DNA sequence: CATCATTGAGCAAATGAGCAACACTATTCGCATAAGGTGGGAGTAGTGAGTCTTAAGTTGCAA
């Protein structure tokens, strides 16, 4: 029912749909990982 | 016997096309910009005929 989605951006969008916006404080979080 | 035309032969003078080597500058290339800006959009709509290929539905049929 992955309908042969031939847009590259349609799959794009379902992989990069995975992770979610991140808070401006968790990029000091990451950024102290750094 | 003399001499010259007449056939080779090569050269200086001149010149046209370069060459390398430095030296200088035009152009190009590559990097930076701090409050904040966290899911596209046009996508045609009035073909039809055929032929090959799956895909699924049905259906004998045998252990």
Do not use: F, N, S, W
Request: proline share 3%; no cysteine.
């Amino acid at each position: 029912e992955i309908g042969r989605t031939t847009d590259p951006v349609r799959m794009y969008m379902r992989e990069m749909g995975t992770v979610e916006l991140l808070t401006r404080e968790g990029e000091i979080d990451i950024a102290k990982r750094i």
